[PDB]
Design a protein around this nucleic acid. Structure first.
Ligand SMILES: Nc1ncnc2c1ncn2[C@@H]1O[C@H](COP(=O)(O)OP(=O)(O)O)[C@@H](O)[C@H]1O
Ligand SMILES: Nc1ncnc2c1ncn2[C@@H]1O[C@H](COP(=O)(O)OP(=O)(O)O)[C@@H](O)[C@H]1O
Ligand code: BEF
Ligand code: BEF
Ligand SMILES: [Mg+2]
Ligand SMILES: [Mg+2]
Ligand SMILES: [Zn+2]
Ligand SMILES: [Zn+2]
Lengths: 337, 343, 248, 366, 373, 237
DNA sequence: TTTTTTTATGTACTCGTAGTGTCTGC
DNA sequence: GCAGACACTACGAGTACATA
């Protein structure tokens, strides 16, 4: 069936959206807002299997029409998926233009057509802007589908003409119960990983299943080593990687939990590791702690913003910046205007 | 297969020909003049008809026409001069070469010319079959420190007198670009057949046309010589490599140097270089490089470098290449910047 | 691919479809912003299978009677499908069975049925494009006009193959210019009577039209300089062409 | 298979007559004066923010230029040419998806056939949408045709922003800046549309949809269509309030007063409670900025509060009494900078926490 | 007669005699002197910002060269060749829209055809417009012909950014830079255009159009046509002001004076008046910044005020005399920060209100008093 | 004579190489270019390259003097130094500019036509404003801003050059000969402000110019922004 | 002695190849 | 006839360059 396994919390929204697509008053451009890995793409695939099914019933595809076997076979001339090319993290304007020009003709099968964009935010500005005038005035029986982490990042014009359908991550008790049903280790680290993932159970599942957990353990051990001594340089050995911004996010999360502990907040994101946050609060002044926080976040967004930048250099310069900030009598950054 | 130097390839050329010849190595001009010497030696000998073939993938072997059929009006033997691709050939071409050798006539000579090949390309079927009788020879341009002796030796071979100042200005202006060096030597010889050139007009007949690969750039910046670094950057003009290569280079050595300074309190710098075998001709040039610095100095360097790193790639700056002039010069006379930049 | 409804059957020699397509293929759009402009319009009438091709500035419509009752239906077929269909025509003895659908065009030739996807658009009303008054009408020998236009066009402007008719009483004057100024003038004796008039227009298009129809005696109809010219053969009215003027 | 496919409001209610357009009084008056008086021009570019109507104004102008009545200020709407332009069949209105058809090849192709007379209409209108994504060569190719086109061809440009165009093209067209539509115009148009569409609506819900659209008919109308899916058949205040994530409660000013008094624990507790309830963060900081503005304004001139501000005056005037004038502006600047950096933060809640901690860093004594 | 055709002011009023030009001296004089002295150089490039006359100057010079009589600096408007180039599509003027001719496949054809002699007049004038759009191979192809063209070929190259050209092309041909026009010249041209158009006009509206034209005459003429459309066929200060969005309404000097006098109530009243007027706030802020800048410039040197701004010069001088430079800098920085933060303000009116309030309360000589302690 | 060889296609270069390797003895053929780096190394190595140097200012000046004396045109020396300086070294450039000078000067290349050219050849502007910032010179700042406005160079680049000059000045303050090769023609005036001005004032000026650049694009006009930067710099000391 | 390491999108040019009009002594 | 010449025109690829 769906590539990503069905998630139980996605059932209600499905029905609601199916309702909007049964009366014929679907918006033909249903920009899904869901946290990455939470199951936005699964919902898109279920919906598109419904729509491109020329013989559906109720609220679920027949699964018997040979259109459905084309769907499960992964090949269909009325199903245009736009994904980044293998090895490149952006989908070009060439692919979007090809899809739009191919969508010009009728439906091959005597039914509807669906263009599904794998991730809206990854669109190049030229590519995204070339998708206008095709989802604003689409051909008859044309449906679009887009998924994103945060709609505000998109181009303003493109977001303007798309029905922004939100998905809420499940309540933390339900999410931790599901994780414990699927994932095995302690509930404390489970909750910590869930919080690190902005509340998305799928990303916490991905962090635990992958090697990211052992990487986080090594990084937190290195932090425990570095904080009393001030040898932040060693942390480079755990930061420089293909997935560097995620670990920088972990570091910033630790810093913010330290600042909250200084303010005495009861609930913290890194609750699984009280020793680290306690040490961070003890050894670092809040005035310099917020400076460390700001530079960490700035460098994170620079790593994740500009494509193909030398992560090693920026990470090491960050580490040297903390080295300077540890030294007393230094000017601290102020968020500029 | 012998893997010798052309100073001996001349000796094997003077003696009986050892079947196919393969001269390799990236050469500014030495490859072409060695080819010319081979051509004249062959012309003195039997083989005279030099058929030029460009070895390349997706290009069929028209050489088989010469290989299968013998010349009919003037046989006079003949020589197939093969031009290898800059990355080396593929397996199909490597085996078709063996097929050609199977088609080799007694009056046929095989000359294969190219750059250094990969081990699989080096140990292909054709080379393995030709390892019994053919020869292999390689050469490379002289280094910066090896230039003056080579230039003086060439001048003495050409029967023209040079001077220390003339050699200095030549090795500065023509550093590793032997074609330009040879043309300048001929120009100085023809301009004045007096045979005495000390420093009268050698600069007048010599321009600034030389290659400059990035590895030497830090070699100046580590001394912090303002005028020397500025002149090196001005020399880099008109052969301007895109900034990313230079940036990768200096970020490599500065990360290495900052790691070295962090570990300097630990195991000494020599045994630390034992890990950092970057072959900077001794690993001791870096040893005298690390003598003149400070931790705050490294901070001031890394701040500017990392600010440039986002200055060229985040927003595609156009002055960023000239920014390489800015970053290298400011470090020369900056013991430690009292913040005021802290980028 | 499955079968389709709204599927009227045709029985016609391949020569009929070949004549039709060859009559209205040179005036079919090629990579133009108007997406419906590509391909040919096949429209079914009780009288014929009319076909319409246009670039927006060459409107060629052919009408070969079919002898069968045809429910009114209008279709647009893209350029690729039309070219392939014309390639699959030969022989002239086998009956071609053209099967129309909502989104596809199928065709049975001999023992093979081939299909083509169908452009989604609403093609313009060609009848309104055709001029509403043929007040100035002239007839002239087809081959004579073709030869004269070729002669004039050999000095015409290269990028804009543009000549100018000057129609006077029983006389056609062709005048052509180009960069590196060269003037080509040619006078033809025609069967014309009416108001003196001049009109500039592309000559490649008119040469193409005359090549397509190639009758004994052509006649064209026209009113004013801005007005488009409607050219057909004087024998029948099965094929009509519309050429839009140069200048203004 | 609905009526064509525009069961969505965004396409169904695009105006068909200059009388049916909302706002844009200056540009509509200018176009009507030009059409009726006879002063016509070959190149108009309409520049304005998204969802204001530059495409619609351009198409309506194209209708008005080619109506069989003559060059009429108000298009017929019933005559054959207007019907054809509505269907898109009209062979002289050459619309261009210039964002999609960017290559200079196609610009040259469409410029070669400019000399031809129009097929049926008076003028051969070259409507170009999203002009700003033309490649530089295409922009410069359009130059000599934009400047002195033949007598019968007229260009229309419809770009999101004007400053990306080269200054050469920007100096050869009439720059009509479409003024963004204020809240009242949006509310009136939305109420009229809903009354035509026969679905019950509440005035305050329409006020929310107007104030959240930031001046755009397309944005507000899409938001209403989203609410119709949520609020069954009706744009109800509760449903749109929950969907839009508005700050119905008073926790906004509560965490304002917690933040200005350097109560980190209280601010964190309020943030945790709001995140648990399901708040939206951008609206939170917008409300912060508004409340701070009201506090500062009554700090300067009292009796400036209105409605809800005039009701919570008991707290607002006390805050204006206790907070110095200098620190109010600093809090406002910090909050607005945080709102600026909300997109550049992996988690929205984490971004708001960062902003609040930056604000509390002004007085981080305890 | 008045010839009521209503066809685009820009195209109707393109200069046709050598004297109708707006007042470019350093290029018109040079061209006239060259044509008088017989020094007709075979290739020269006109540069300058958009809509100054370079494409027009090229047409005038081709008119002058190919006149029926001897080469005359001031072309006649009666001979067949001048009439033809006047009407366009002239036989010997080959106007090449180089932006449409960039492939070398066409420049090669051009250099192929260049040899054949012209039929009428003396020269054949290759007016290659938008030169900078030619592809590199086309430039290199043109190089040898430009160095030594035949006797009867002149190359009229015109472009907007000559720095894009390969430097050798700049070397081959002369270089005439056309300076952007002054406000007085452009206003005089607008007066002439409207007077000949028999359209009533108001001096303030013409000054507004000249100011907003950014020193390029076609911008002013397009704006004049747009204002003629905006009004009921007449150019009025009210129509131009409302169409441009300028703040001539209630000026802006009242707002800045209320700022320096620290009267919050006056600022509020002016803000409410502007809001009822429905003005855009960013334009108001830009006006305030410009006022501050002019005040500072006058404080450095009283001759900085423009003649177009001679309406409020006394109060301008007084504000320059009173406010110390540091307060002016503080106001400028505060208002500039406000303008930067306007897109991120909760509302443009509210953001401008707080920017005014911040620049008021931080005024050192009269700050907003601390409430209690 | 195959002029401008750098435009030959790759296969064209291969044909040229096959002709050069076995050239007929009875023929030769020259060759010319402007960007020699584009030729293949084989043909460059084969050909006996001569490199032709850019003309010096004195060479161009004397040649132009001779040319003007040859036909009939009177000339004054300062105009000729100006023409040579603006020629940037190319003799053909000097001849094109002397044609323009003759045209504007009505058959006489006097100092006034080349003064009209002076608006184009006037280059040294960024250093004078830096020198005039550290004090109140009166009309110097107004004249320089008028020149910048009438010249319309990139204001962002102008202020970046200002910042670079000021930063190297601060570098010289902490090192008596920090660059040395910076502005060899102004090694007798720039040094005074390189050492006399206190480093604290230099840091404050750097702060002012950095703040001005950071806020420059948001000014009503970039000319107004640079004016305000200059006024702020002149406001303090 | 083998050593790190930016893109998307567009525009030209020149070399094969492939397909097709047209027509010439075969 | 006529197929093969012979021309001619269009398309892909490999390369060089530009600009954001
Ligand atoms: N001025 C207006 N009057 C009426 N409806 C408008 C107006 N502006 C926008 N709309 C609505 O917005 C929808 C899209 O308008 P459109 O003209 O495409 O905006 P854009 O300028 O961004 O392309 C229209 O279908 C119409 O419902
Ligand atoms: N010097 C001038 N005198 C009069 N009108 C001018 C002048 N320069 C520009 N214009 C106006 O601009 C219109 C187009 O000018 P144009 O010469 O095309 O400028 P460009 O140099 O950018 O091609 C003209 O029709 C004319 O009205
Ligand atoms: F800006 Be609109 F959505 F075309
Ligand atoms: F409008 Be101009 F030729 F820049
Ligand atoms: Mg639009
Ligand atoms: Mg022009
Ligand atoms: Zn099914
Ligand atoms: Zn005349």
């Amino acid at each position: 069936g769906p590539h990503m396994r069905w998630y139980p919390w996605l059932r209600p929204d499905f029905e609601k959206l199916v309702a909007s697509y049964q009366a014929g008053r679907g918006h033909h451009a249903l920009l899904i807002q869901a946290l990455p890995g939470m199951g936005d793409d699964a919902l898109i695939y279920a919906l598109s299997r419904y729509l491109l099914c020329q013989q559906p019933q109720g609220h679920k595809s027949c699964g018997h029409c040979r259109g459905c076997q084309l769907m499960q076979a992964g090949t269909h001339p009325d199903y245009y998926t736009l994904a980044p090319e293998k090895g490149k993290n952006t989908l070009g304007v060439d692919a979007v233009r090809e899809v739009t020009e191919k969508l010009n003709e009728h439906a091959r099968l005597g039914g509807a057509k669906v263009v599904w964009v794998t991730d809206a935010a990854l669109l190049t500005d030229a590519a995204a802007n070339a998708l206008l005038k095709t989802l604003e005035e689409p051909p008859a029986e044309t449906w679009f589908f887009l998924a994103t982490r945060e709609p505000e990042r998109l181009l303003a014009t493109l977001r303007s003409r798309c029905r922004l359908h939100y998905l809420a991550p499940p309540p933390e008790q339900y999410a931790v119960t599901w994780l414990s049903r699927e994932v095995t280790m302690s509930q404390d680290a489970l909750l910590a990983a869930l919080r690190l993932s902005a509340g998305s159970p799928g990303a916490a599942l991905a962090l635990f299943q992958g090697d990211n957990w052992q990487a986080r353990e090594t990084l937190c051990q290195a932090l425990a080593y570095s904080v009393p001594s001030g040898d932040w340089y060693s942390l480079l050995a755990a930061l420089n990687h293909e997935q560097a911004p995620a670990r920088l996010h972990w570091l910033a999360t630790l810093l913010m939990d330290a600042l909250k502990r200084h303010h005495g907040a009861a609930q913290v994101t890194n609750v699984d590791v009280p020793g680290l946050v306690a040490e961070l609060a003890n050894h670092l002044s809040p005035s310099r702690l917020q400076a460390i926080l700001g530079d960490v976040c700035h460098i994170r967004e620079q790593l994740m913003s500009v494509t193909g930048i030398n992560r090693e250099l920026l990470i090491t310069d960050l580490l040297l910046r903390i080295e300077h900030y540890l030294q007393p009598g230094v000017v601290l950054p102020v968020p500029h205007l | 297969m012998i893997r010798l130097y052309p100073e001996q390839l001349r000796a094997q050329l003077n003696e009986g020909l050892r079947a196919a010849y393969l001269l390799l190595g990236n050469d500014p001009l030495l490859l072409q003049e060695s080819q010319d010497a081979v051509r004249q030696v062959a012309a003195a000998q039997g083989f005279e008809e030099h058929h030029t073939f460009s070895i390349d993938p997706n290009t069929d072997w028209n050489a088989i026409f010469s290989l299968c059929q013998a010349m009919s009006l003037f046989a006079s033997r003949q020589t197939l001069l093969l031009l290898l691709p800059e990355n080396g050939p593929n397996a199909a071409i490597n085996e078709q070469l063996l097929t050609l050798t199977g088609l080799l006539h007694d009056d046929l000579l095989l000359i294969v010319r190219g750059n250094k090949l990969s081990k699989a390309q080096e140990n292909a079927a054709w080379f393995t079959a030709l390892a019994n009788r053919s020869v292999q020879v390689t050469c490379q341009t002289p280094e910066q420190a090896q230039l003056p002796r080579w230039v003086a030796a060439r001048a003495k071979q050409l029967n023209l007198e040079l001077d220390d100042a003339a050699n200095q200005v030549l090795c500065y202006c023509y550093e590793g670009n032997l074609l330009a060096l040879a043309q300048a030597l001929e120009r100085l010889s023809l301009l004045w057949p007096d045979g005495k050139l000390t420093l009268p007009r050698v600069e007048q007949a010599v321009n600034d046309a030389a290659h400059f690969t990035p590895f030497h750039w830090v070699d100046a910046l580590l001394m912090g010589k303002s005028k020397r670094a500025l002149h090196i950057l001005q020399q880099l003009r008109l052969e301007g490599s895109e900034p990313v290569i230079l940036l990768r280079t200096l970020q490599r050595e500065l990360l290495l140097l900052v790691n070295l300074k962090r570990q300097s309190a630990h195991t000494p710098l020599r045994a630390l270089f034992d890990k950092h075998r970057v072959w900077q001709n001794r690993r001791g040039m870096m040893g005298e490089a690390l003598n003149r610095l400070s931790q705050t100095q490294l901070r001031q360097a890394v701040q500017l470098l990392t600010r440039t790193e986002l200055t060229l790639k985040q927003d595609y700056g156009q002055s960023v290449w000239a920014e390489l002039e800015g970053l290298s010069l400011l470090l020369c006379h900056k013991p430690l910047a009292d913040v005021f930049i802290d980028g | 691919l499955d079968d389709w409804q709204s599927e009227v059957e045709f029985t016609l020699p391949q020569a009929t479809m070949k004549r039709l397509i060859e009559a209205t293929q040179f005036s079919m759009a090629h990579q133009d912003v108007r997406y419906y402009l590509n391909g040919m319009l096949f429209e079914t009438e009780g009288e014929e299978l009319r076909t319409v091709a246009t670039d927006g500035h060459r409107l060629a419509v052919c009408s070969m009677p079919i002898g069968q009752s045809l429910p009114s239906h209008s279709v647009i077929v893209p350029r690729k499908g039309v070219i392939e269909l014309m390639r699959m025509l030969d022989g002239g003895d086998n009956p071609l069975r053209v099967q129309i659908g909502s989104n596809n065009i199928r065709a049975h030739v001999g023992d093979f049925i081939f299909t083509s996807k169908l452009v989604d658009g609403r093609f313009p009303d060609y009848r309104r494009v055709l001029p509403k008054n043929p007040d100035k009408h002239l007839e002239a020998g087809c081959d004579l006009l073709k030869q004269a236009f070729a002669r004039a066009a050999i000095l015409s402007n290269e990028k804009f193959r543009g000549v100018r008719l000057y129609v006077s009483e029983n006389q056609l004057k062709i005048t052509a210019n180009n960069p590196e100024q060269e003037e080509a003038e040619e006078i033809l004796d025609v069967t014309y009577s009416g108001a003196e008039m001049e009109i500039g227009f592309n000559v490649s298009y008119v040469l193409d039209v005359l090549n397509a129809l190639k009758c004994e005696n052509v006649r064209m109809m026209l009113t004013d300089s801005v007005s488009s010219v409607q050219i057909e053969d004087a024998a029948s009215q099965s094929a009509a062409y519309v050429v839009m003027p140069m200048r203004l | 298979g609905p009526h064509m496919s525009y069961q969505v409001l965004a396409r169904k209610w695009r105006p068909q007559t200059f009388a049916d357009v909302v706002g844009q009084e200056h540009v509509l008056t200018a176009l009507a004066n030009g059409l009726s008086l006879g002063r016509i021009h070959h190149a108009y570019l309409f520049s304005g923010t998204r969802g204001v109507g530059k495409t619609s104004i351009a198409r309506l102008l194209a209708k008005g230029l080619n109506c069989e009545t003559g060059i009429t200020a108000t298009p017929c709407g019933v005559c054959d040419n207007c019907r054809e332009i509505e269907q898109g069949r009209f062979v002289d209105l050459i619309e261009i998806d210039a964002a999609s058809r960017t290559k200079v090849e196609d610009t040259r192709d469409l410029l070669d056939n400019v000399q031809y007379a129009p097929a049926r209409g008076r003028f051969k209108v070259y409507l170009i949408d999203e002009v700003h994504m033309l490649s530089r060569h295409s922009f410069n190719a359009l130059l000599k045709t934009l400047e002195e086109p033949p007598e019968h061809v007229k260009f229309l440009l419809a770009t999101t922003d004007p400053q990306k165009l080269p200054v050469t093209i920007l100096s050869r067209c009439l720059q009509f800046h479409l003024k963004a539509l204020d809240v009242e115009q949006i509310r009136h148009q939305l109420e009229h549309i809903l009354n035509e569409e026969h679905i019950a609506h509440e005035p305050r819900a329409l006020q929310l949809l107007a104030r959240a659209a930031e001046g755009s008919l397309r944005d507000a109308l899409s938001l209403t269509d989203q609410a119709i899916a949520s609020g069954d058949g009706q744009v109800s205040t509760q449903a749109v309030s929950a969907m839009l994530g508005t700050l119905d409660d008073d926790q906004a000013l509560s965490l304002v007063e917690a933040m200005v008094e350097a109560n980190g624990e209280r601010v964190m507790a309020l943030i945790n409670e709001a995140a648990a309830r399901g708040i939206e963060w951008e609206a939170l900081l917008v409300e912060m900025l508004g409340l701070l503005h009201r506090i500062a304004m009554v700090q300067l001139s009292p009796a400036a509060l209105g409605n809800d501000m005039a009701a919570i005056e008991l707290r607002m005037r006390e805050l204006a009494r206790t907070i110095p004038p200098t620190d109010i502006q600093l809090y406002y600047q910090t909050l607005l900078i945080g709102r600026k950096e909300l997109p550049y933060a992996p988690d929205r809640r984490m971004g708001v926490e960062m902003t609040l901690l930056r604000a509390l860093a002004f007085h981080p004594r305890m």
